[PDB]
Design a protein around this nucleic acid. Structure first.
Lengths: 128, 52, 124, 147, 187, 134
RNA sequence: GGGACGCUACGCCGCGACGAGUAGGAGGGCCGCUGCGGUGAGCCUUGAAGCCUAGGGCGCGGGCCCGGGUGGAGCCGCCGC
RNA sequence: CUAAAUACCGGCACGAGACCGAUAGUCAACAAGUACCGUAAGGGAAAGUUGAAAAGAACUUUGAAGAGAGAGUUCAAGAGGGCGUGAAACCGUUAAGAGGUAAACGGGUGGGGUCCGCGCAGUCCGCCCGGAGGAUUCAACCCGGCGGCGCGGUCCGGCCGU
């Protein structure tokens, strides 16, 4: 009973696990965000077996399915009612998402305008 | 330091060139719309008013 | 001209917005709402525009005349169509194809009008 | 624009574009033009020949005002006077040669580099070259000295 | 494993001009269509030269253009210069000419039109001759810059005449040992 | 815009003048508009407040149409104290609630030899804008 | 003699070949921080910034957007600097 | 002997900032050249934030009291006197899981939790047919307005000429 997209291609991802920083588990000061090691004796840098994999260009997703939601749409950040009428010619391909700082009474302005335009909302019933 | 090169000098012909480009682009209706001006009700964009 | 002003409005324009790997324009006559040379409502001398009616029932068709090009108060004339779904799409097709008025956007106006009439249809 | 500089791309690189063996030390070769008769001999000979030594006569109180003698070639001789005088010079049937005062426009010497159009002139200048005179006489002109 | 070298597998050339001005880009857009739709190589030289840098498309003096039209393609034939067409002051008589250039100096426009000449822009050239038919393409002296006198074989070397980098020329500015046969050596 | 070159537009400097103003300047900051019935009669917009003036509260939690007089003028707190504008303490005593003079309208003044002198003087220059301006 | 899409031409599309990397060099960042000129009839006590999060996700990646909690007053998107 | 153009990190009073924001900016945003140290010459800190308003917790009860438990103020004590927001290292407690090759990690699965999909009878959109209905309803004409084009083969008149 939701808003179907025009087509529903098979979403394929070469890797879904996050690329963690080297020795991120051993320390708290070392965050999860990836940093490329540049040490002379770094095992990860020279691709040793059984080590942390590094991000490469080969892990890129397909251009047809890039930035596409599992529902089949692509997201678009919407702040007010006026930004909704942009997507009514992009109805079957792109969906709208309300921003975090939008008030509850302005969120309940948005939802029905996209319902009249049949625009899918990722988070329709956010606050209530 | 205080003696950082704050100021920049432009050639006189180049200073006069941009003013001519700025005045000429102010008479095209499409370019002024892109500046966000809400003047769709203006009768003529080269708005000339009497000296009163 | 059309090609000269396009190279200026393509990046530094107030109607253009860019986020989430997308680009859109909020021009009053930009049907399909995309930043493009063909669909820019302000760039071209001849422009077709489809907007919802003021009372919510029907569609208004924006027609741009070629006489007052630097006279924006007179350059645009607006006609309101409040007929049935088949007859509304027949009229907008006739104003574009049979007048030879910027004919590459005839179906784009048909697509926009077909959704605006659907938007004002009573919701289930 | 510090955002366009090289140091923004060098973040995360240990040696900062200066190598790991030859570290970016303070002054490995010496300050300034050190080592002219020494370790920088080859650069001072392959690129700056004649740097070391004295030649010529010293001149204690030299005034550049005394040596001011600007020159003009025969190319831009007619550019000194206006174009109207050039048209009327060939148009006139009496043969009245117009006078071009070289000192008036701000030159003292006249050099015979270029070709002269075939119409007489009267050239007033502070100095003349030998070849510049024969070119003027070859057209049927006159060289007038002035101080 | 493939034993090929990726050292020079990427050709270095200009695909589009580094200038951000919009009038050249509209002229570039016009000549991209003419290169891939017409069979003339003239639209391939013009389009290649429109991308080029300022030092690559040296100004062409007016006297050179008179000289190359004293030996023209046998007289009505237009002149096409990608650079700027400058005026020469050591030329007396100018004939009527058909000149196409990106820019013409203000004195040169008055001098050419005084002789009954005609000056066209590059968009007018396409409307006149789309294929470059009956055209002479010219260029200024590429090695005419003072920079090239410092280039080449280094000074202080036998038979390597090249201007050294000196702040001011004088009797005590690189006239010593590296130049004097009396002092050390000379080349 | 302000055009006087010797008049401060700095935020930090202006707050320094306000919070470190001397006592004779503190009274001038504490001016409140008169009630509408007074305004045609005296032709005065606003006026500094004194110890005994009848006050209606316009804003805040104690706003209403009640008529109360001032108890004291506390120039160190930018606070005045009104008669029945007060809240209950825990122990049973009553404490006057502070109301800023900006949210105050004066319905009756405290007439005096020095009080009356300002009334024509403020109404003198008030009229001057209507002869010079007209 | 009465008719699908297209084309931000700095865009779109088709063919083949290739993809290691220290020092080092170059390019692209709709990666990130701060302030300024424009711009969004931008967000906001019906809840800003900040912080926490066993949720939904996106991008190879730098990182980012929503869901929940706390918070009480500012903040952000795009074009350039 | 002699003013003017000239200099001015001290002093008086100013105005301003594409500057910095309590480990920044003067050492010093605060009882700062203060506390403190050295015989002395001298060295020289740390330290901003309750709340809009103290409305700063009346009163009852345990304890000798510190400290609590009720009650009360406030929009909010989850703002309760060094009190705005309260992160990490670290510690205490609750819930779940696990535990003889120190712990931790990459790839691949599997199991258990967590909330979410608000899924639990699975798509609608156009074209054609059927019959039930309901309209003020179609094509074609007349009138008025508006717009486009015209090679009107060259109609007429204006305006301009980089």
């Amino acid at each position: 009973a939701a808003l179907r997209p025009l087509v529903k291609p098979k979403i394929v991802k070469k890797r879904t696990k996050k690329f963690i920083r080297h020795q991120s588990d051993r320390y708290v000061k070392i965050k999860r965000n990836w940093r490329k090691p540049r040490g002379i004796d770094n095992r990860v840098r020279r691709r040793f077996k059984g080590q942390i994999l590094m991000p490469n260009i080969g892990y890129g997703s397909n251009k047809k399915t890039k930035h596409m939601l599992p529902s089949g749409f692509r997201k678009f950040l919407v702040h007010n009612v006026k930004e909704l009428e942009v997507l009514l010619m992009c109805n079957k391909s792109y969906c709208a998402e309300i921003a975090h700082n939008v008030s509850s009474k302005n969120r309940k302005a948005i939802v029905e305008r996209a319902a009249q335009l049949a625009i899918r909302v990722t988070n329709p019933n956010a606050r209530l | 330091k205080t003696w950082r090169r704050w100021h920049r000098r432009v050639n006189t012909t180049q200073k006069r060139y941009a003013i001519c480009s700025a005045l000429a682009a102010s008479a095209l209706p499409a370019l002024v719309m892109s500046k966000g001006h809400r003047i769709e009700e203006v009768p003529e964009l080269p708005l000339v008013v009497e000296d009163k | 001209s059309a090609h000269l002003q396009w190279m200026v409005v393509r990046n530094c324009s107030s109607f253009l917005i860019k986020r989430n790997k997308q680009t859109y324009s909020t021009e009053p006559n930009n049907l399909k709402a995309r930043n493009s040379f063909r669909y820019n409502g302000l760039i071209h001398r001849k422009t077709v525009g489809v907007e919802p009616a003021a009372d919510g029932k029907g569609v208004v068709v924006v027609m741009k005349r070629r006489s007052g090009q630097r006279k924006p108060a007179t350059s645009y004339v607006r006609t309101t169509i409040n007929k049935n779904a088949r007859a509304t799409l027949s009229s907008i097709r006739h104003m574009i194809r049979k007048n030879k008025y910027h004919p590459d956007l005839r179906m784009a106006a048909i697509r926009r009008a077909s959704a605006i009439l659907r938007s004002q249809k009573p919701v289930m | 624009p510090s955002r366009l500089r090289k140091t923004r791309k060098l973040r995360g690189h240990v040696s900062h574009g200066h190598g790991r063996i030859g570290k970016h030390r303070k002054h490995p070769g010496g300050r300034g033009n050190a080592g002219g008769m020494h370790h920088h001999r080859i650069n001072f000979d392959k690129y700056h020949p004649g740097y070391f030594g004295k030649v010529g006569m010293r001149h204690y109180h030299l005034k550049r005002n005394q040596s001011f003698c600007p020159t003009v070639n025969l190319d831009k001789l007619w550019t000194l006077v206006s174009e109207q005088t050039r048209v009327n010079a060939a148009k006139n049937k009496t043969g009245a040669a117009p006078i071009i005062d070289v000192v008036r426009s701000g030159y003292y010497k006249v050099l015979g580099k270029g070709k002269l159009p075939k119409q007489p002139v009267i050239v007033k200048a502070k100095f003349f070259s030998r070849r510049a005179e024969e070119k003027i006489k070859g057209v049927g002109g006159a060289c007038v000295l002035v101080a | 494993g493939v034993d090929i070298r990726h050292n020079k597998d990427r050709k270095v050339r200009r695909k589009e001009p580094k200038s951000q001005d919009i009038y050249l880009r509209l002229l570039v857009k016009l000549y991209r269509f003419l290169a891939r739709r017409t069979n003339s190589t003239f639209n391939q030289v013009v389009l290649k030269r429109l991308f080029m840098s300022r030092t690559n498309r040296p100004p062409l003096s007016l006297s050179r253009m008179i000289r190359k039209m004293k030996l023209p393609g046998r007289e009505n034939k237009t002149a096409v210069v990608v650079g700027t067409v400058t005026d020469d002051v050591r030329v007396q008589e100018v004939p009527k000419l058909k000149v196409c250039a990106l820019r013409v100096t203000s004195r040169a426009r008055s001098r050419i039109l005084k002789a009954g000449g005609k000056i066209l822009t590059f968009d007018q050239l396409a409307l006149d001759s789309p294929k470059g038919r009956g055209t002479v393409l010219l260029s200024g002296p590429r090695k005419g810059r003072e920079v090239y006198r410092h280039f080449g074989k280094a000074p202080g070397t036998p038979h390597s005449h090249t201007k050294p980098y000196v702040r001011s020329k004088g009797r005590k500015f690189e006239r010593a040992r590296g130049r004097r046969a009396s002092r050390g050596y000379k080349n | 815009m302000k055009f006087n070159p010797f008049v401060t537009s700095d935020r930090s400097k202006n707050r320094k003048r306000h919070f470190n103003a001397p006592s004779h300047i503190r009274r001038k900051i504490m001016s409140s508009p008169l009630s509408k019935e007074l305004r045609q009669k005296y032709n005065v917009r606003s006026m500094p407040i004194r110890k005994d003036d009848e006050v209606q509260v316009v804003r805040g939690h104690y706003k209403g149409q009640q008529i109360g007089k001032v108890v004291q003028v506390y120039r160190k707190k930018y606070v005045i104290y009104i008669e029945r504008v007060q809240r209950e303490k825990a122990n049973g005593t009553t404490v006057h609630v502070g109301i800023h003079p900006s949210k105050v309208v004066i319905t009756r003044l405290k007439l005096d030899k020095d009080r009356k002198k300002i009334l024509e003087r403020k109404a003198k220059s008030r009229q001057v804008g209507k002869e010079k301006g007209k």
